[PDB]
């Protein structure tokens, strides 16, 4: 059980049973003594999982079209930085088949259904496999564990059929996510100070590591 | 719901509603019939 910056508070509750546990909570945020909304340790674990997964997707998709745009078959009209995609209009914008606000309403609808039902599995497990949902209900009954509902939709290949491999793959998902969150954070700060996109920034550091934007600390759009 | 109607029946709230209606009424009357020191219709 490797421990990183543990404390007497942290080791009082961080048991090692939680996937990815290194006994690290110097602020005692997962302390089970005082518990109201959103300071439940369970909620913080499910939150680290969800933030981690979304951060994997974003860490990939933010740098992907730039890289493929460097040397690849993607049209350079569509190969941009993540922040010039139209996400941030003053950083850059692109005209899609929609006005980017209708895109936002649409995505908030779809994410509306997915996220609302996900939450209903958190608040009442298995409640999403009962009311008529044009089928699909069976995979929406959940595994009893909200972060890991599995079933046919979310775990069709059923990796980690034994508890050992599932626990190792959970440790893996946790560290993968903790890496991806720091990744997208790095995209934020790099694109903030550098402004050329994360991969082009890395390349500015490749041919010339002596570049080292740290000491420069210059910023332009 | 029943308790809320009860609260809305309490003295200060009924008073604000009542006098607010009365004020709107008197204001509009002085809007269509301004000035007037007398009852002119006799």
């Amino acid at each position: 059980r490797p421990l990183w910056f543990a404390s007497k508070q942290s080791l009082s509750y961080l048991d090692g049973s939680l996937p990815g546990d290194y006994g690290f909570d110097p602020l005692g945020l997962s302390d089970p003594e005082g518990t109201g909304g959103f300071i439940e340790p369970r909620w913080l674990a499910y939150g680290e999982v969800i933030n981690g997964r979304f951060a994997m997707l974003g860490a990939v998709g933010a740098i992907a079209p730039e890289y493929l745009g460097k040397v690849g078959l993607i049209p350079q009209e569509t190969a941009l930085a993540w922040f010039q995609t139209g996400v941030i209009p003053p950083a850059g914008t692109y005209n899609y088949w929609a006005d980017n606000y209708t895109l936002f309403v649409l995505e908030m609808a779809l994410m509306g259904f997915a996220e609302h039902r996900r939450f209903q599995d958190w608040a009442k497990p298995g409640s999403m496999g009962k009311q008529y949902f044009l089928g699909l209900e069976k995979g929406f009954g959940g595994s009893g564990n909200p972060a890991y509902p599995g079933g046919p939709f979310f775990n069709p290949l059923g990796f980690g059929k034994d508890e050992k491999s599932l626990k190792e793959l959970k440790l893996k998902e946790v560290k993968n996510g903790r890496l991806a969150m720091l990744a997208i954070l790095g995209y934020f700060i790099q694109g903030l100070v550098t402004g050329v996109g994360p991969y082009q920034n890395l390349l500015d550091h490749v041919a010339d590591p002596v570049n080292n934007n740290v000491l420069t600390s210059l910023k332009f759009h | 719901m029943r308790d809320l109607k009860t609260y809305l029946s309490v003295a200060p709230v009924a008073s604000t509603l009542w006098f607010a209606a009365l004020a709107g009424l008197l204001i509009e009357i002085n809007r269509f019939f301004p000035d007037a020191l007398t009852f002119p219709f006799f």
Binding site: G28, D31, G34, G36, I39 | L4, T6, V10, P34
Partner: protein, 743 residues
């Protein structure tokens, strides 16, 4: 001892059931009224939480959520001010021509004749001139369009919603534990470093990126619509660099400690910008930066979870000496137990602060085109004086409520408090003497001057031309400030404030902003009046606190409560022995003191400061420098101040200022109305009511809620409330009509 987030879930159920049960909080009031007195008690006890329950945790939760309610109201009020600035203001026209246009942010409907109050404020705009000062703030913040004001009003409304939500949330869902509130080191660490520090730093950020540049384009005469938007200065650093070249570096001088190169937009010049008459925005941004550093440092003093730092209890206990015994031992237990104690200290310091703000904002006008807007300046000074004085009287009230309710030497003892209580007679006797001495040797000098002037002996008066009482000490002080820049402040270019340094008169739009304020026998006499009035207020309030428990007249006084009318006609008569009645009596003296202060301000500023200046530099003050020779006599205050300067408010009928005439007379009316309550007593009124009740029973229209005269205490409270409202609003109308007409 491990500081952490602590709450409880769903302590109180959200329901309208107790909305429908008036007085639900009190076991007696909840039974409903048998008499009309019930109706008053329901309102007097509504916020007295520690009378509703004895559980400290419940009280703390009520207090916390209530603070959320207050902040919600404040954000709704700011939303109102910004929205009226966007939708019903002439702020853009004023933004073009500030020295001419009058700021107006309220427009009235044409219903009953009242549209006359929509006066000519300039910019082709009819409305009510505002003295709050929001135009100078918005200009100092770089705000140009009404749209920006709209966005600020919407954000303010959203934050009102968030604060209200958090109040409901932390009373009904996640309500902090009592240990959470008592974590004082955590709270002080987060309010010093987090709230004040990061707030000041954030504001310095907005100023260096928005306020400074946009104000550079405004001062350079650029049209506000042609000024680049504030974020264009963040994007293209060439705009800023053209205005402020240092921004070409890329904050490398900050990390390399080359900070002197930032002397471009971070400055210690001091004084006033002669174009705007306000303080240099470079000095102000630099100021907020320094303050940010100081508070960020101050927020690491107290130990929490990592062993480094201070425990406050340790610091208290170490501080004791041969005169004070074990003093400070026990104060950590009192200040983490009694809400009224904390509220007492915080009211004292917050009111004292508000008064200091009142001085510093006139003597160092922080916003552009604020100094020359005399209506706004007079309004601000007077306003903050009133807030301060009220808050201080409150501090006395809650020191008294602590003494009566939370003081217990058998449980939470303190040596200093015990010793004070053990020579309260000496303290109050000496304060009494000082008050008499100050009365004679401040006001009696005025009476001396009136009598000598009436007898035809002006050479026997106390005057700059007869018997001089020069404020030598203050004069020496302002001289030292005048000499400070270059000597004891070599970084300071000019004087700290133009009231100190000779010369360097600042004028904007022909009107003066600040010049050196003279000091003489008149100022001496007035200042001793202020000393006198303050000392008598302190006497009444401190006497109220120290004898709240007991006295030689009433040994068991604490058993009668904090707020009680008397202990009867015996012992010679014991009316107004309660600490509450000492707060009642002290309110009148706070009114007296603050009244003379603001009269001193208006009089002195119109006589020796404000006025118009010639093209060749000849200054004509609003009044003819008549402070030195006319204020040294009570007749001069009656004649050359009240009788003279009231002409505007009694001549306001038929103009847009006529509302101030109406409020003049009406405030006189409510003030005289208070004398009915203050001079009489409820026995008479209850008997009269007996006859009126007879008349109603005769016609079958007597109410079941039996009519009762007000309580003795309520008689006093009504009385002092109307006295204060009438006097203060009278001076309000007087001031605003006067300074809006002649300013």
């Amino acid at each position: 001892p491990e500081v952490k987030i602590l709450v409880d879930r769903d302590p109180i159920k959200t329901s309208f059931e107790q909305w429908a049960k008036p007085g639900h909080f009190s076991r007696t009031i909840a039974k409903g009224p048998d008499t009309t007195t019930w109706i008053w008690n329901l309102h007097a006890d509504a916020h007295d939480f520690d009378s509703h329950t004895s559980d400290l945790e419940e009280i703390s939760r009520k207090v916390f959520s209530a603070h959320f309610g207050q902040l919600s109201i404040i954000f709704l009020w700011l939303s109102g001010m910004y929205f009226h600035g966007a939708r019903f203001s002439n702020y853009e026209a004023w933004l073009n021509d500030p020295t001419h246009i009058r700021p107006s942010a309220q427009v009235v409907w044409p219903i009953v004749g009242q549209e006359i109050l929509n006066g000519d404020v300039g910019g082709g705009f009819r409305g009510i001139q505002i003295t709050s000062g929001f135009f100078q703030i918005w200009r100092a913040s770089g705000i140009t369009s009404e749209l920006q004001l709209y966005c600020t009003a919407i954000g303010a409304l959203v934050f009102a919603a968030l604060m209200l939500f958090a109040g409901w949330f932390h009373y009904h869902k996640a309500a902090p534990k009592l240990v959470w509130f008592q974590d004082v080191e955590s709270m002080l660490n987060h309010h010093l470093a987090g709230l004040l520090g990061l707030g000041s730093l954030s504001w310095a950020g907005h100023q260096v990126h928005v306020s400074l540049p946009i104000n550079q384009f405004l001062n350079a005469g650029v049209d506000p619509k042609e000024i680049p938007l504030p974020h264009e200065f963040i994007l293209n650093r060439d705009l800023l660099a053209q205005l402020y070249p240092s921004f070409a570096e890329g904050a490398t001088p900050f990390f390399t400690l080359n900070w002197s190169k930032y002397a471009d937009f971070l400055t210690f010049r001091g004084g006033l910008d002669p174009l705007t008459g306000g303080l240099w925005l470079t000095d102000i941004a630099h100021h907020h930066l320094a303050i940010a550093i100081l508070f960020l440092i101050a927020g690491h003093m107290y130990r929490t979870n990592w062993g480094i730092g201070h425990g406050i209890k340790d610091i208290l206990e170490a501080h004791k000496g041969p005169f004070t015994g074990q003093g400070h031992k026990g104060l950590y237990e009192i200040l983490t137990t009694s809400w009224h104690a904390q509220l007492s200290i915080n009211l004292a310091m917050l009111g004292s602060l508000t008064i200091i703000v009142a001085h510093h904002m006139y003597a160092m006008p922080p916003y552009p085109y604020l100094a020359t807007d005399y209506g706004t300046q007079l309004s601000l000074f007077t306003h903050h004086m009133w807030i301060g004085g009220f808050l201080i009287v409150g501090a006395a009230a809650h020191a008294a409520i602590f003494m009566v309710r939370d003081y217990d030497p058998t449980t939470r003892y303190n040596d200093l408090l015990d010793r004070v209580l053990r020579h309260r007679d000496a303290i109050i006797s000496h304060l009494n003497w000082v008050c008499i001495f100050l009365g004679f040797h401040s006001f009696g000098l005025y009476i001396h001057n009136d009598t000598m002037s009436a007898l035809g002996r002006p050479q026997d008066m106390f005057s700059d031309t007869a018997i001089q009482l020069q404020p030598v000490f203050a004069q020496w002080i302002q001289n030292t400030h005048a000499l400070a820049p270059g000597t004891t402040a070599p970084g300071a270019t000019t004087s700290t404030s133009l009231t100190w340094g000779g010369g360097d008169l600042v004028s904007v739009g022909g009107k003066v902003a600040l010049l050196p304020i003279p000091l003489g026998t008149a100022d001496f006499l007035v200042h001793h009046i202020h000393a006198f009035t303050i000392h008598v207020t302190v006497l009444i309030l401190l006497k109220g606190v120290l004898f709240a428990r007991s006295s030689r007249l009433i040994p068991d006084k604490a058993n009668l409560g904090f707020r009680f009318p008397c202990d009867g006609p015996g012992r010679g008569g014991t009316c107004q022995v309660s600490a509450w009645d000492h707060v009642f009596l002290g309110l009148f003296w706070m009114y007296n003191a603050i009244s003379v202060v603001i009269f001193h301000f208006s009089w002195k500023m119109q006589s020796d400061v404000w006025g118009s200046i010639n093209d060749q530099g000849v200054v004509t003050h609003i009044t003819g420098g008549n402070f030195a020779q006319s204020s040294i006599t009570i007749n001069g205050w009656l004649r050359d101040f009240l009788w003279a300067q009231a002409s505007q408010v009694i001549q306001s009928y038929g103009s847009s200022l006529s509302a101030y005439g109406l409020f003049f007379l009406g405030a006189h009316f409510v003030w005289a109305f208070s004398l009915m309550f203050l001079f009489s007593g409820r026995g008479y009124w209850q008997e009269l009511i007996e006859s009126i009740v007879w008349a109603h029973n005769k016609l079958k229209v007597a109410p079941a809620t039996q009519p009762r005269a007000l309580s003795i205490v309520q008689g006093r409270a009504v009385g002092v409330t109307h006295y204060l409202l009438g006097g203060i609003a009278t001076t309000w109308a007087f001031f605003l009509a006067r300074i809006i007409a002649v300013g």
